[PDB]
Structures are given as C-alpha cells and as structure tokens.
Amino acid sequence: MTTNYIFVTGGVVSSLGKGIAAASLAAILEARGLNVTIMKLDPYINVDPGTMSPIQHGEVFVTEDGAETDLDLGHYERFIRTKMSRRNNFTTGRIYSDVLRKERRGDYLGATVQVIPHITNAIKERVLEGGEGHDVVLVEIGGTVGDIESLPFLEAIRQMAVEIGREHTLFMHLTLVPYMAASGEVKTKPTQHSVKELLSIGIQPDILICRSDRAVPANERAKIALFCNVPEKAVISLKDVDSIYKIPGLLKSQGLDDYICKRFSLNCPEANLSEWEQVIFEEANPVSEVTIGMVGKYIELPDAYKSVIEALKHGGLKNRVSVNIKLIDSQDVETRGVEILKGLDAILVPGGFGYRGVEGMITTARFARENNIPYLGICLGMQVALIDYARHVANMENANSTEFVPDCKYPVVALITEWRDENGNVEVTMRLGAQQCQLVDDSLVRQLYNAPTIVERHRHRYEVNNMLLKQIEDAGLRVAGRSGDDQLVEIIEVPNHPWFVACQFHPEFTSTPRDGHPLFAGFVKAASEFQKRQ
Amino acid sequence: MTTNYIFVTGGVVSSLGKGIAAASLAAILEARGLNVTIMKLDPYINVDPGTMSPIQHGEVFVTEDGAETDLDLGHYERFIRTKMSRRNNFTTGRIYSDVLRKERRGDYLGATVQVIPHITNAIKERVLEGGEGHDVVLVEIGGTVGDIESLPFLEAIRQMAVEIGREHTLFMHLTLVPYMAASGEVKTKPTQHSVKELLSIGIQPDILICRSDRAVPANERAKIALFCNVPEKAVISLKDVDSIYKIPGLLKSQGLDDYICKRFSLNCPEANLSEWEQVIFEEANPVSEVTIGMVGKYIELPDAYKSVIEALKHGGLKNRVSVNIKLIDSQDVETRGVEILKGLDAILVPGGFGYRGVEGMITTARFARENNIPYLGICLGMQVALIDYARHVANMENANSTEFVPDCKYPVVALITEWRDENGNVEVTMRLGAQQCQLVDDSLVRQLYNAPTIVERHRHRYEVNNMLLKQIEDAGLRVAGRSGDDQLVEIIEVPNHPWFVACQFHPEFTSTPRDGHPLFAGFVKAASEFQKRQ
Amino acid sequence: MTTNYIFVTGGVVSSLGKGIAAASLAAILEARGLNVTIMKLDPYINVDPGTMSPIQHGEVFVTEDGAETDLDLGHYERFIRTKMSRRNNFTTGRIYSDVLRKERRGDYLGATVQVIPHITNAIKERVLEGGEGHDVVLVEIGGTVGDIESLPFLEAIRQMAVEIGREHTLFMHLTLVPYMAASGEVKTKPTQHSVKELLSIGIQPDILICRSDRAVPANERAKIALFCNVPEKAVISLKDVDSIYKIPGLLKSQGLDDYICKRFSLNCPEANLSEWEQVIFEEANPVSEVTIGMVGKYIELPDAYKSVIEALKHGGLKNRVSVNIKLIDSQDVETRGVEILKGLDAILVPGGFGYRGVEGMITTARFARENNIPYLGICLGMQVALIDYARHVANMENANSTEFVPDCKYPVVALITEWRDENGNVEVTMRLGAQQCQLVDDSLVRQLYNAPTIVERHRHRYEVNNMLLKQIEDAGLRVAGRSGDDQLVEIIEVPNHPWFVACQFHPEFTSTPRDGHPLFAGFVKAASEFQKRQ
Numbered sequence A, B, C: 001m002t003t004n005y006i007f008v009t010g011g012v013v014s015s016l017g018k019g020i021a022a023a024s025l026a027a028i029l030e031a032r033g034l035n036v037t038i039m040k041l042d043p044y045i046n047v048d049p050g051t052m053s054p055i056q057h058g059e060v061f062v063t064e065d066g067a068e069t070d071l072d073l074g075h076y077e078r079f080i081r082t083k084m085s086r087r088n089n090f091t092t093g094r095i096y097s098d099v100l101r102k103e104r105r106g107d108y109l110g111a112t113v114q115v116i117p118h119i120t121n122a123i124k125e126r127v128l129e130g131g132e133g134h135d136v137v138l139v140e141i142g143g144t145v146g147d148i149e150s151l152p153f154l155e156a157i158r159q160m161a162v163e164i165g166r167e168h169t170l171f172m173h174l175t176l177v178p179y180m181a182a183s184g185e186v187k188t189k190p191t192q193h194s195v196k197e198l199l200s201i202g203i204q205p206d207i208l209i210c211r212s213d214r215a216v217p218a219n220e221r222a223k224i225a226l227f228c229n230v231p232e233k234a235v236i237s238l239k240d241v242d243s244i245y246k247i248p249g250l251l252k253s254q255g256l257d258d259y260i261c262k263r264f265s266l267n268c269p270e271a272n273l274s275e276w277e278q279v280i281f282e283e284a285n286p287v288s289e290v291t292i293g294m295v296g297k298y299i300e301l302p303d304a305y306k307s308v309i310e311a312l313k314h315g316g317l318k319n320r321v322s323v324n325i326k327l328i329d330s331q332d333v334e335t336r337g338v339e340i341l342k343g344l345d346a347i348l349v350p351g352g353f354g355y356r357g358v359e360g361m362i363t364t365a366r367f368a369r370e371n372n373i374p375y376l377g378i379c380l381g382m383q384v385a386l387i388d389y390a391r392h393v394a395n396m397e398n399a400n401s402t403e404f405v406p407d408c409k410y411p412v413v414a415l416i417t418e419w420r421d422e423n424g425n426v427e428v429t430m431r432l433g434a435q436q437c438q439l440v441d442d443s444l445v446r447q448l449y450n451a452p453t454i455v456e457r458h459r460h461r462y463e464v465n466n467m468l469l470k471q472i473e474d475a476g477l478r479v480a481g482r483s484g485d486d487q488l489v490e491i492i493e494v495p496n497h498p499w500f501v502a503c504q505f506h507p508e509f510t511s512t513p514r515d516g517h518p519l520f521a522g523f524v525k526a527a528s529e530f531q532k533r534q
C-alpha cells in the first residue's frame, strides 16, 4: 500500500475540461476495484467559494461535512463513489491564511517565511492529507501552465514527484491541438510551446491529453510523442463530445488506464463500464420529451444551477424522458406576468439569497399550484411555496421572510432567534452539509425515498417559523419531513395536486447519472404524465 | 508637482547593495533641494520583521511611528532627512493579509480574487500611499529578478510605469559584472541573461548599476549600453568600496543625478555633498584609536546590532577616533570569566530578550562599574546595570527581571502590572516608537543633549519597578531621565565613575554619520580619555 | 562495448575552463586504462580557425593529419595520449557547409531543409564519427547556455541522450559560484538561473562543476545538489589554481571519476596520478631561474603563442629551471633598437605571417647570434635567422622573403614555384601536419633528439630557396634537417654559438608536461648555462 499521485495540469487555454478528464479517468480506475479520490487546487485568493457570487464562478457545491467548494467536486461525486470533503479542495488564499496564522503562533521560530520552502510545504502537506489512504489520487491544478498564479502549486508537485519517485507519480497534461481550415489539419505547435514552459519549471509530462473539436490523428499523436519523449500510447486524443458520460469509454478504448496501472505496478482486472454504457444508451434513446421551466435569479450564468441541471438530466435517464430545461428569469414574471410560464410540463424554483426576483418566484409557485403543473422547490423554492400558500390559501396578507421584509406581519420564514407570531409574541448561523431528516408516513416523499429517514445536504440560514406553521397546516398544507430537536420543517407537500414537493435541503448534490435521485425521478415522471394529458 | 518613481531592481545575485545604492542616490537628489523618500518591498511572507529573529534577518529597525521594519530603513534614515514610517516598508505577507481581510468585509462583492488584478492593485495602492507628496520616490524591490517571489511586485511596478508614463518613471537595475582571472576582464554575460529575464516580464531598464570588485571599464559599459539599448551615460560603474559614505560622490561623478533630473524634467542646482566629503575626510584621518567591547547574545550575526555598530562609528567621526568594535559573546563571560573583558577602553551592552546570556551581561556591567571602564547600556543594557547595582551595592540578593525569574524576591525590572515590593505588596504591552523623555538637571545626559526634553525610540516590554527604585537611588544610583504619567525610568547614571550611562530607549536609531549622537559621541570621547590614562 | 558520452556545457560566463576540466577528467579516466577522446563544438560561423587572426582567437593548433583547429585541442593532447584529428573539432560554419553541399547534391530529395531535423542530424553524425570506438567521449559545447548560437548543438546532444539513454550519457555543466564581500559567502543564484535555462531546452544536468576564486563549501554544494535534483557527490568544487596540472588530483579527490565509472558501469582499477604528481613536484622545486625573451608580432594576446609558452614551461620542468617568459613586441625593436633585448638569458622568435615587425625579428636574430645569446627560431623564426645570416655574413644585401619583398635581388625564402637566383635564373601551397624530417650527422639536433629521423608538424607556405642555399652554407651556416624529394630545409644551426637552432616545423605542438620536448629542454638548459656565465 504505497499511494500513487496523478498530477493533472492544463496548457494553451483554461477551458480544457481538466476536472471532467480527471473524474472520467477516476471512474475507469474505480471500475477496476481501486480506491481512488480527486482534489482541486484553485489559484484564486478567495479563502473558499463561500464569498464567490453564483453569476461569476458558478454554483457553490456542498460536501457532506459542510464544506463550501468548487463546482468541480460535483463532477467528482457524479463520476466516483468516494465522498468529497474539505480536504479535496483548497485555494492559494487558504494556503497563505494557513502560513500567516502559523507565523503568529510562532511555529516558524523567528525564521524568514518564503514562497520556497514555506508556501510549497503548506501545499504539499494538504495534498498528502487529502491523498494518503488511497491507491490513486488525481490532483487537478487550476490555471494554465506559464501563468504566475499556479507557479507555487507546480513547484510543490514537482518536489512531491522527486521525493515519492517516478514509480508512484505521473504528470498528465491537457493541451489544445486546434484545427486550422487554412492547413486542413490540427496543429501541435501550441503543445510544443506549452510543454517547453512545463520543462522550464522542472516538470516532464508522462501523458498528453489532446483536446480538439475533432479526433487528433495517429500522425499528429506520433509527432507529439517524439517532441515530448513519451510512448505514443501515452498520447491520448479527446475530441469534443455531446455527452461527458462517453469520456470514460473513449479513454479506456485508448488504453490510458492500462498505461497508469503498468506505471504504478497495479495488478487489477479490466474496467467494467457497463453502468456508463447503460447511461449512454438511456441518454441516446428517450421515448418521450418534456419542457421543464427553471425559474430563478441567476439564469444569466447557467453554471449557477450546474448540479440542478444535471439532476434533471438524471431524472430524464431514469424515466427514458428527454428534458428540455428552459431557464426563465423570475424578474421577467414580476414585470411581463405569467404569460412566460405557459407551455411548461413542470416548474422548478432553485435556491437563492436576497429579495431581488423572489416576488416572481412566489407568483410562479402560485401559477404551478393553481394550474396543477408539477412543482419542485429547493431551499428558496420551498420558502416561496410556503409564502404563496400562507398568502393565497391561509389569507395571511403580505406573509414573507425576515430576510426580505424584516418587520412583516406574518414572518412565515425567519431565523430561529427572530421567530415571532402575528401579535409579536415569542417562545422561551448557516446550516451546512449532511443532516438526517425524518419523513412523515403517508407523504409522497416517504413513498419515493421508501425509507423513514434520509440524509440530504443544507446551505441556508432562514427556517420555517413553527409559531405560524399550524395555521398554514390547518389551511391544507402538509409537513412531509422534519429534522433535529427544534423539529425544523425540511419538506412540504400540497396534496390536492398531481405532484407538488418543496424541500429546504439541496437534493441536486446527491443526484448521479448512475443512481439518479428519488425526488428528481418522481418530478420528471410527473412532468411526462402532465404532458400526455394535454 | 507630478511625483516621479525610480524602481530599483537587482539581477544575478541578491547581495548587490540595492538599499545603499537607493539611499546614496536619494542623498544626492536631497542635496539638490528635492523632496525624496525611499520604500522597501520585501517578498517574504512574514507580516513584518517583528517575529523575525535577529540572528537570521538582522536588527529590527524602529521608525518614529513605532513600526517594526527592515534594517534597510536604517540605511535610508542615515542617508536622508525625510523620516521613515509604516508606509516605507511592506512584505508579500502584509499584501496577502490586506486582500484576505478585504475579502471578508465583502469589498470584492462576490468577485474571484486573482494575483492580477487584486494582489497587484494592493501593491500599487501601498506604493502610491508611501510615494505621493514627494518629487522623487525610490522603490527598492527585494529578491533577484527571475525568482517567483518578486513576480507580483514586478508586474505591479510595470503597470504603474504604463499608467504614469516614461516621463515620470525610471527602472534602475543593479547587476553583477564579475572578474574572471582566466580572461583578465569583467564579464557582461550575466547582465545579458538578467536583462532578458526583465524584458520577458515586460520591464525595459533605463539605468544599469554595474557592481564588481573593481571598476567596470568604458569598453564593457559600452557593450552593456548597446545590448540594453540605453545611453552609455545611463550605464554606471559601482565597484566594491571601503566606505558607503563615498557612494553618493562616486555616483554624482558619473552624472547619474543629472540623467535622472533630465528624464524627470527637474531644474535644480548642482548637488552640495560637502557634508559627505567632511564624513569621508573624518573617517580617513583618525587622530587616535580605541577598542570598545560590545557584549550581547546575538554576536554570531553582526547585522543584529547594525545601527549600534554604525552609531559607534559616528561617535568615532565626531571625536576623530578610530573605533575597533570587539563583538564578545555574553555566555563566554558566564563560563570563562571576566578575563575576556581585559584590554577594552569601553564596554557597550545592547538590547535583547530572553535570559540566555543575561547573567554574563550583569557580570560585564559589574566589571565596567568597579574598574571605572566607560559603560553604555541600551534597553537590556540598562536592565543588567540596574540588577548589578541592586545586587552588589544595595545588597538586594538575586535581584532580577520577571522576564527571566518571575517569582524573584526583588523584581527591580517587571511589567507595570507585575510591580510588587520584596514583601509582595502592590499599588492602587510592547512600547514602540518616538516618546518625549524629561532629563534631570545636573545629570551627564542633560549636559550632553543640552536640552530639558529629548525624543528617542522604544522597543521593550519590561520597565524599572518604581516600588524598588528609591532603595537603589539611596544606595547611590541616579535617575537621569523619565517619561509619561507613570514617571517610567528612561536613563540611569552611576556618578562615582568617569562615564556610566544606561537608557531604556534605542539611541542608535537616531544616530547619523553627518549629525552623530550626543550619547555615542560622549561615550567614544570617554573611551579615548580612558585609553590615554593607561 | 557501448561508447559513453559526457556532454560538457557552461553557464553564467564563457571563460570557465571547459577545455581544461574536460581534459583533466580525461587524464584521470585514461589513468584507469579507459580509451578516451575529447571533441570541441565551436558555435562560430568560420568553416575552421585557419582564417581567424591569432590576436582575435589565439593560436591555430595543428593536428598530425594537418587540420587547423581550436587551441583547446592543444590542452587535449597535453593531458591525454589519444591523438586528435579533424574529427575532434568542428564549427557551426562546417555544419551549414555540410548541409548546403548535401542539398545541391540533391541528397535531401526536394525536402524542406530545417534546423530540426537536418542541422541537428549533421551535428549528431559528426559527434558519432569522432566518438564511436572509444570507452568515453567528452564533448565540449562552446558558448554559454541560453545564448542563440549554441541552441542547435544543445538540441542535437539532447536527442543523442534520448536515443543512447541515461546508462551511456552524462551532462556535466560548469557554472560560476562567485564570492561577494557584502555577504562573505559564494552565491548559488547564478547556477539556479543557468540550470533553469538548461531545463527549458530539455537538458537535466547530472554533474555540476562549481568554478569560483575559492573552495565552494559543503553547505553551498548541498543547496546546489537539492535545486538541481543531483546527489551531493555529483556537485564538484573547482576553485582557481596556480597550476592546471593539479586539476586532475582535485577532481579525483572528490570522486568525480568514481561517479562517472559507476553511471557508465565501467569496472576499472583506481587511477594512479603519479605522472601528474611528478610534474607538480618538478614545477614546485626549481633549482635556478632564467628570463627568456619571446620576440613576435602577436604579443597583444598571449594565447597567440599558447603552445610555445607551454613548451618553454615543459623545458623548465625537465631542467628544474623556473622560466620567466618576457613577451617583447618585435616592432619595439625597429623603433627603440636592441635596448629592450638586454638582460635576456635566451631569445625565441615564434611563427607568423606578413612583413609587419619582421625587420625587428631579423635585428633580434642578429643580436642573439653576435652576442652569443641562446636562440630558438620557429618557422618565421627560421626565415629571419636565414635572412640575418645571408645579409650580415654571406654579404647578400637586402636578402628577404618573396612574402615581404617579392622582387628582392636575393629571395633566400620564397615559394618553390618562385625559386630564382641573384641573376634571375630558375630550375627545370600550405604544408600542414606531421611530416618525417631527416637529421644531419654531427648536428646539435641529431644529439638532442637522439635519432636520425623525427616527426614534427608544419603550418607554412614559404620555403628556404635551395638556389641561394649553397652560398649561405659556404659563409658558415649549417643545414641540420631536410624532408621529402625536394630536400626542403627543415632545421638550420650556427655552430660558432653556444646554442643557435631554427626549424620550419612547430615543435611546440608535440611538447607535453610529462614527456617534454628535446629542442625546448636543450634551449632552456642553454639559457641556464648562459645565466651562470654572467
């Protein structure tokens, strides 16, 4: 049991799919019975993505231990079974924070603290912490080789390779081999210049992953093999694909996992990708089609809802339904009205913070409730469902969250500390990661999950006000799930409806293409049944 | 009034004297009536030198505003009259701290924080903050061009030069032009390779400062001029010198200040270096010689006492005395005895923290007191003087500091909060920077300073215990200076002695070669008078 | 067995002694019974040094096959017994000539001829041609790594290392580790930046040879070992020495030959350096001293007479005489007269072309003959001796060479085709390399060489005119050596003299420190005997 490291770097351009490639290779190695994990080194100065806005960087992924991480850890969990944690993602910001704090504690004992060895040591420690206890660890280095921002990471992993040796380390380098119409060929010159930059910081690549908008022919792979001084079988073609689920198969067909198993002296059986073959087959052969509207406030960057979009596609796979996801701005509902929600087979309202676009989401939940259009609300999606039912069925005028209108008459959503009733009477912190939720018997979700208890991941501050709940319950709404000693509301259902479910937790973070998700499967099934009735 | 910047970089090796060169050039420009200042950008991760050990990095310099800074700010204050502050020195550590904290306050508004532009912006802001309000600002970049650690600094100052323009910015690059016996010539090839590294990060030097162990001939300067595409008058020879006081004259004689005044369109009169000429003359023509023992715990790196060594040399200049400074380990006095203090014309005990070597310093103060050898104690040097006089004249057995022996019977030195008497009765934070001190009339120091009040700089925690003082005063010791509402003891004198003075403050930080220092002048005079009597 | 290659490169500066170090290592390896050779790759565009002026490049060394080569091949032959040929030296000029010629002969079959692979292939072919059939081949790359001029050489040897493998190739990189008074240490930073330059062109050094004006301490070699990822025993200190004969011993004492033999899996006995120890002992323990004047037209650059200066030193070793070589400009004899030839124990006039300073050499030959000062003339040195004698003893007025005065009455020196007598009556180009010479009985040289025939190396056009020889022989001059069918004069003597010999050939090219040379041994012995008589 000696841990092996595959360092995954990128050259020429940023957007090579380093994460997908690492995840896809991990999927193959896992399918050979190996204990594998992946970690992402981000060269940004942000301590973590907690502060980073959804419409700049994309969604904040949440691990079961409650870490706020890069959305790439979503790819990782959707390609391998090994659970991600805080240890599988860190930034330059985290590393400098670690070192600045170690300096205050006087751990450096009056020494001058330097990029080498102090910053590089801190990086190596975190890679080893995340890596050890595994057969193979894939380490994705963010950025493009040659840029300033990744130089400490590259020096760190260069040092690791010298210490551990070439028997238990590989350098896998993604590169752009672009097509020029003028020459009618793909061009290796960018790979030549990129590999030279890599050599100049003391890294020799073992494996070249050649990204292009078409196949990189054997002739160009042979050229790249010579000038990089690697075997031709270590030069892999990875053309643009219509589905990332095909990538493990494409890499296996070129023997990449065989090459890695030989270099690391791992005797393991052939990769069984039958689950991926099944996923590819399902995706290629949908029986029917549905249009599902996603109504939120961050649609200007789709990656803001990355895991939700994937969870809907997984819902499609399990029902053999093709899902046409229509991203709709909730502010457009406020101004233009509910005319833009017409022609939808189902409606999803995903998570969010701040009041901008929330009123449109409340109107959207009303439209879906009154017109019997299948509805799934996630976090904020549950809040607007509760506000709708409180306002329009329990006749609680201007019911809202304390997040949006702090001094509202009926704060049906509020922090536990803010909980008050309509007269101002009282009783007597971000919830993050995995928590057990108890499901109410005879509820739709109890049926779908087929268990009394489930584990789903949170990222929210504002809870359902239990002081105003019974009034909403008596007006017809049903509590389907609860959690903890405070008996916090986790899931609500509207029963006089074909399919209406809203949850506080983020089920999208537990959905995979191979195992799907009970809520998303149920939701997409309802969308199909609705479409058939029209 | 448009502020001009001279960016001072170094190539080939670290130890080119970038600070001395910057300070020496500043001295010339100041002697032309210009408002000039200097700042040091350090690529270490240490938030500031406060934590850095004296026997690794050298002395912690203290500005009047109480900043703990690089010893280079000592060079700056000894070459120009412009006072240094916190703004004239910052590290990579400070810059990352600034940015990490701005991220928490949400000043970046959900943006991805990047080396460019966020780290480079933070660097530019601090350079502008320290620079603006001056005719010429010299910005010393620590490190060697081509190293990772200085890349953000070099990108920052490259950006500044583009924005401000070539009319108000210059790049001054120090380089090594070494002599090879084999070729019998100095070699420009290192300068060629260094300048290429500079070009590759988008900086073209305006001025080449050629360091060698001998003159760089016109022939080699002409070669460097062509391959750097600068005028030959912008290629300066700076050979190894026996005295740094000569460097302003050597640079002026090659027209460097004329070149800078033309490039910045500054019409100012010829530099009057008559004060530097006087310093050089004094240093070259000492009338007599003295041996002064410096007894401390950090002698293994002389730079630990950099400003004290310079202050003694300045004492020599003002008395026309050559001072032979003998660095003596205080632990050698503890083991080998006072035999190693023989042949000294005077004794100095400088500042320090921790008990290691303190007992030797107490014995050293006793030797100097009993044998009438001129004594100067600085900070710890005053503590061991008080402990000596308390133990051996006031018969206070085992009198000590609470820093060294917390539960001692007579804590003659302690924190204000720890102040107790011998029976345990009571009454009823690092002191940093400039503080007014009141001088007692008929004291030696009142005579030397010739003023009732002085301003000197502190760097100490532990004070003289005023509860045990009167007992030491009545045993003959005299309080010569005090400060503040707590009437803290700043200066003590033993009067039955030719010259015995010890101060809490660090007078070495206010000494210059041009103006000297009253205490050091008096001390070195006493050392000469003692030597004549033997 | 498989031929092993040591590629010898240089960083930081040109003048590291790459040739001396390669030659000194070859001497250690030859002493271990290995078959070793050395070759020099010069990045100049000159087809060969035959065109290059001696005051620009230094001496044109001549191999036994008549090749005009770099003076480094003189170092090679003075350290190893392996004979150099045309194959042991080529330039970029030769490589481009090779390729341009092959192109016109249609050898490339209408292909585009490129730096890679056509120029690099031509370099590799010539390195193999000189190397194959030896145990170890040392390949010296001229220039400084990072310069444009050496990039094709470095790419060629990089390719060879990939093909041949790490089992039979080593990269030995010389670097400058300069001392700084400011730091009181030698600086590894230039080696750091030079090695980064090597890595960027795809070469990893195996051995670092650290040049400095002093020993590079264990601490500094340890830093270099870590940065370069080489073992500490592969980092060698080579300080400046008084004698190059010590360098084999300094390298052996640090185990360099052991490391090379281990890497190449050569089992050979320990080196016995007794021959070098003896040379060092002889050099360190002279018995008497002499001053020998070398009177020529190229003294501006001493390396113009590299092999002659070394031959005189070797003559010193054999006689236990310390030789003070005084370089005298022959043009100074024309202006200031024979005043400057005073206090010389012997006179040597070396080789040269063109009339400038020749009349000064004729005056010098006359001075030495008339005042019985031991004389050795080489090539031009023989011409001026023959001219002196013809003019001043045989009374042949204005006797000269057709090279200098084509239409002179008495062309005593002239081309074979030009041979005429005083009346203009006739009979019915460059000589290069080793030729047999027949020595005359009862001549001084017949005794000294102790053989009837000798082999010496030529580089000359103009011969002794046989049509005017008889007349000069009748006047007392003796012919001591002849060659070929034309019976060309090789050696002349003046018997009415303690020691007066002059030869057409260059005896300095067959002199070594271990074996010496009979002519130079005799010349220095005569200079000693003359000094004792004064």
Ligand SMILES: Nc1ccn([C@@H]2O[C@H](COP(=O)(O)OP(=O)(O)OP(=O)(O)O)[C@@H](O)C2(F)F)c(=O)n1
Residues within 6 Å of the ligand: A186, A187, A188, A189, A190, A223, C114, C115, C116, C117
């Ligand atoms: N380090 C190097 C490497 C190569 N070349 C030169 O590069 C030239 C070939 O460059 P091309 O015509 O663009 O072709 P290609 O390299 O195959 O690149 P692509 O895959 O994008 O088509 C040779 O003359 C050379 F000479 F080989 C060079 O000058 N320096």
Ligand SMILES: Nc1ccn([C@@H]2O[C@H](COP(=O)(O)OP(=O)(O)OP(=O)(O)O)[C@@H](O)C2(F)F)c(=O)n1
Residues within 6 Å of the ligand: B186, B187, B188, B189, B190, B223, C013, C014, C144, C146, C147, C148, C149, C150
């Ligand atoms: N970028 C460059 C610049 C120069 N050179 C080549 O560098 C060679 C000259 O290098 P030297 O003999 O060491 O001399 P020097 O440069 O004056 O350096 P020093 O001052 O240390 O003596 C030319 O043939 C060249 F060709 F000019 C080069 O190949 N690439």
Ligand SMILES: Nc1ccn([C@@H]2O[C@H](COP(=O)(O)OP(=O)(O)OP(=O)(O)O)[C@@H](O)C2(F)F)c(=O)n1
Residues within 6 Å of the ligand: A114, A115, A116, A117, B013, B014, B144, B146, B147, B148, B149, B150, C186, C187, C188, C189, C190, C223
């Ligand atoms: N590629 C590199 C390598 C090092 N350094 C930085 O280089 C700094 C140390 O450089 P020094 O003080 O000049 O010392 P030295 O390297 O031992 O060189 P010498 O042997 O000439 O004294 C570290 O802070 C660093 F950070 F390690 C760097 O920034 N980039």
